[PDB]
Amino acid sequence: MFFINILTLLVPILIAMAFLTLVERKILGYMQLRKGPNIVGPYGILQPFADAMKLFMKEPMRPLTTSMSLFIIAPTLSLTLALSLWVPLPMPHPLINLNLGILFILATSSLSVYSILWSGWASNSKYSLFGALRAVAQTISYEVTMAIILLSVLLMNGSYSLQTLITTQEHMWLLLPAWPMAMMWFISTLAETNRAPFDLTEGESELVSGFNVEYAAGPFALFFMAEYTNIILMNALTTIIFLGPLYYINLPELYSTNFMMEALLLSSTFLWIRASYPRFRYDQLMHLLWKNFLPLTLALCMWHISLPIFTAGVPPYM
Amino acid sequence: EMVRKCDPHIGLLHRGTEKLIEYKTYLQALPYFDRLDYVSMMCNEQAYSIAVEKLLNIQPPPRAQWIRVLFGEITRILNHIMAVTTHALDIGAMTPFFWMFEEREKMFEFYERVSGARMHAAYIRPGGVHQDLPLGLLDDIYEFSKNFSLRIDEVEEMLTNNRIWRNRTVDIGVVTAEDALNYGFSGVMLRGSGIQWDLRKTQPYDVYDQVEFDVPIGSRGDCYDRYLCRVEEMRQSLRIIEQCLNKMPPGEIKVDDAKVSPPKRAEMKTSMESLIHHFKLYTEGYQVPPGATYTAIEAPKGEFGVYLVSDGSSRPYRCKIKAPGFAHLAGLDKMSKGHMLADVVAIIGTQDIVFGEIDR
Amino acid sequence: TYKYVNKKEQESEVDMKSATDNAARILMWTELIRGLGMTLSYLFREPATINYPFEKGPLSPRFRGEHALRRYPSGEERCIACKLCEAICPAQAITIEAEPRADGSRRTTRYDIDMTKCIYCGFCQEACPVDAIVEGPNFEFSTETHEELLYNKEKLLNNGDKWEAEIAANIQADYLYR
Amino acid sequence: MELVEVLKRGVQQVTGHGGLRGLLRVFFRANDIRIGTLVGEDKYGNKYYEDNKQFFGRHRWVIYTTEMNGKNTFWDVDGSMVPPEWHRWLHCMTDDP
Amino acid sequence: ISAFLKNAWAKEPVLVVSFSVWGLAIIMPMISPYTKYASMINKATPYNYPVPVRDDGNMPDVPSHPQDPLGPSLDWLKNL
Amino acid sequence: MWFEILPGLAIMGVCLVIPGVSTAYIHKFTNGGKEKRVARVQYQWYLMERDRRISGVNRYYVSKGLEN
Amino acid sequence: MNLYTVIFINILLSLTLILVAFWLPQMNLYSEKANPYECGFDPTSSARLPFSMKFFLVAITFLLFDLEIALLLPLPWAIQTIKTSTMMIMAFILVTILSLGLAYEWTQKGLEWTE
Amino acid sequence: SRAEYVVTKLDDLINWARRSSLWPMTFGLACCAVEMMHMAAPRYDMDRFGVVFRASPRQADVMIVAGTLTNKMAPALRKVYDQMPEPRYVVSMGSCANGGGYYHYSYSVVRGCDRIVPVDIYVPGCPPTAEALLYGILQLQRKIKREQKLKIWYRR
Amino acid sequence: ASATRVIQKLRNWASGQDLQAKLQLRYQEIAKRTQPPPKLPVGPSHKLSNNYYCTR
């Protein structure tokens, strides 16, 4: 009975992300006085299928100067990690229960960067290298901050398992006590996935495309298969970690219905931000997260270390 | 990612317009100029029109001058709109480019209505203007002008006080005032540094001496101050349109001199001398007296000048085009010192460069 | 008259309220949430896009597009082989090799235009003293081979036994300006 | 309130083309459920509509034929099918059809 | 020093909130009345079985039955 | 218009409800109509292992009451 | 075994898609196509040449800050300790110690990039 | 039933995906590219037809050769054309790209991109109206609509 | 003129400035495409007397 469960978590995610591609092109277009795809289907609902079909029927290449092993293993990790990272996600019952659920996220989310590094370096191209040597700056900028924020947020939850956060927010959103962090978490999460304004690894102006200028249609889709299922995720986590929806044990179906409302609303917000602000320069991203967020995040880490101590609000374990 | 040396290798768009002009009559060479700076279309041929007018020693009629100033300002708005936006497109702000191109499309209807082409209107002939404005086109220009200052504000909200835009643009491309002249800069690049210079207010060539407007000047030389100069020029150009609309004197559109400008279609088909002049002006072309001139006009990029040499013939001898971008891009080496690769991307736009004029 | 664009007027005047206004601005992204507001407004607007195949964008009677050789109402060709549309054409796109027609009239035996050389400048229609060559509104004649853009007299008369219902109305509505 | 008014207008568009089959023939074929006054028709079959309420550019449109010269143009619809007498009007060069 | 404190507040607020909350977290535990209750709550949780102790007739203060009034109590936790 | 975005989201929103609702119902189908017990400490594993060996059928989702 | 299945199901899915990417489409190979892209013109030199970074000082201190969190993630279980006072002092010191190192890195222009 | 019939439907399927996802390349040389932007502008949105601009030739299906092609640039255009994975299409735009246009007789202009890349559709004009290029793109889409590549495969 | 007056309020507030009087798209302010015949004025030098070219 388990294999069937994967299908209800694997196929819908692929369909949902594919229909995010249309929703991106539509929401972006309307903010720009454009009608996104509305010719392929009734309203473009078939546009993602059209893009998917052509890329897998458009020749992928084996460039002479590249490295076949890493050039081919890098996209596989991107999709493998981006899809296997939905696994411990409670909605409200996760497919698998992990005692260290978020640490699974940190290692695996940080493991996705190696897709960009190996993809850029394997594809022996100068622009591909520039994209790789910007993910290192992208990750050195946010990883120190993203880990501390999650520590502070969970420190009023007690454990590390995700599913205890539902119990934590039974009566009040965890945004309200930690709305400072929720802003820093909403940017550090925007740094991962390389979503604008922190769109530097796949830079389309300073670099022609960025760590993709040598990935032809076939393997190229594998990066977009992963670059957008990772957008839905960190929105899925944020609505679980901060915008805690109603659990109501007798009504598990109500959690998912309310969960999707916020996850889409947050997902519409990454696309909304992309439509409004220009892009950072990757030094400013480094300074932004190391001169402004890191000071305050560390100061708030002390604040939440003492908060359960001078309020008698130490959360339980188990 | 720090640039130690830039070597702009222009020449990828060297069509060689200057040599092709020498084999073409003066009227035949007019569309070459619409294609040099291809974002300020009819403000190029004004430079050609003024140069040929000077040698011919004729002046256009009063109505024509106002059309050439009225449409010489729509080119300024057209060209500054792209400069603000395509500059922002490379930086990353894609949205403003889509908003203001819903206004470029509106203005290109004016070209398509005064001329027949959206972009390269061969409309401003040396002998004034080719053909009169269709009825009610001034009303459409006015209805555009009212709504426009709202459009410029909407862009002004997006990318004028953002942290991301100020940090990507301030303190970048600082050009000293002494170097701006020595490098031969002109236009907004001079005014960004602080130098007070504008040919519309120092060497007037049209009714620009009867129209009031302000020339924006920047304190620091960074790309941010010259961004504001471009946005603020749209405001002042939109102020000239109000005046040109409110005083467009009646009269003829081309000089009543059938030896330089062609006669009307009606007179061509009833009077003999008019047919002869129509026949000769379109086969040999009017002959300009021998001489040499350098006329400069304040094209949106800056000082666009044309150096026409001539002999006693209908086809010019040498037509050198002072593209304002030639000096700016040559100075790109000095701008990007101790600045990253992304900054160079943000300095290509701030010069407002098109390589049709540079390479020409 | 000049105008300062980025020059501070007077400085060194800040109190707790003014200081806290800047702190609130920097420390809660007020002027970035302000940019989001404008884009959110644009989502709730009608897009300017128009279904091209079914509604086509506006044009004007003076528009310059596909060429066309006109005829008089009787049926006689207007072109009289005066050959000053190839004198003014600044791309040498036109070629004429007229000879007498064996009924006495001065008519053309070749009027080929190379639409790949032409720049759609409109000089040929304002030079013709009989309006023999015009430029109809047909902007949509893209082809799948280079050769179909090398127009000859037979094509140019076909475009001209086709668009006269349009060409006549356009000329009739702007000849006074000309 | 006003929401009922617009939801009522939507009913007019979805149920203003003869029937369901009439809606299908235009929704997937033109992506335009709008309805406006029928100015006229060609001998080929082209139907020309106008809606003065909408904004400039979208106030005149065609619903092309399904067959012009034994071409079977139900899907392969191209702009070069408006005859000259209507090309002038459809392009907003005149007010008189 | 009033200008310096508020001048930094006007120009670099992030480095003032960090220093303010940094000192606030250090001082708050000393002033709170519940600080001493953080330790007691972590003494209440019986993670390991409470091992009984033999009676030699000289163990009066420890209870006999679990629900008797002569032992440690948590009645302060129910009302915290 | 902007409401044309809803088709993109309407059937997208369904696709993000399936992974959540399906897991809750699949658990109840496999686990005999009870939620999937979660062992985060060794104490709970001993309890599930107890129930697995308490019942004649080697499954921990069948619960024997006071009938012994 | 439930978690092993998921990743290997994902691995098979990723391999099948990429495997179908390379054998389904029609290919036509030649040297001019498989050469490096480099914006139209042939690269002047390989991309394997030494490509100096300038944020190496932040790169090193990122390690020390990465080890630094490894000493903070045990906090949720350390709060359960009976003491609650030794923990708090040894928590502020660790975070304060990191800040002073960051503050000293600030003033020495460590976080600024070599020009 | 006949095995030929199934082949054509698959042929029409692969063609359809290649028609509604026609990604050009941000390769505007000069002075037609301004009208190639207007095609991307609000009035004539290309996202309607699933047409999205991408910088890398490796991720571009069609190449819109818009603007004068000079000798200095000719080697670069062919290189970029080679990088596009097949199937690839070229849409020569404007007089300067179709033939030599206004600079047919210059010393440093290749008389039409047809001398360097094989062109599929020619869009006349100078510049072509944004509709004229859009008619070209649609007329290119109708070209893919009749390929017959899998149908001939059954005949080989 | 089809904003329903509640979205008209939302977009008006979000933008910060009233725009229903300053819309981009044009509805009925544009001059009618067809216009009545003009008669362009005849400029100077059509005097018919005392107009010898040797003077100007």
Ligand SMILES: CCCCCCCCCCCCCCCCCC(=O)OC[C@H](COP(=O)(O)OCCN)OC(=O)CCCCCCCCCCCCCCCCC
């Ligand atoms: C009671 C005692 C205890 C009290 C303790 C609490 C004390 C009060 C705390 C108040 C402060 C809250 C936390 C503040 C975090 C923000 C830090 C910050 O200042 O922003 C950093 C940066 C500053 O701008 P900058 O130009 O760098 O200024 C210096 C220039 N030399 O600005 C930026 O980062 C801007 C660049 C990022 C822009 C990203 C776009 C965001 C768009 C808005 C989306 C917001 C969505 C939030 C909701 C998410 C919901 C999940």
Ligand code: SF4
């Ligand atoms: S429009 Fe101009 S370039 Fe074209 S044929 Fe006529 S005169 Fe020559």
Ligand code: SF4
């Ligand atoms: S088309 Fe007109 S100008 Fe050209 S040769 Fe014929 S009559 Fe003369």
Ligand code: SF4
């Ligand atoms: S064909 Fe005309 S518009 Fe296009 S590049 Fe050449 S001159 Fe410019």
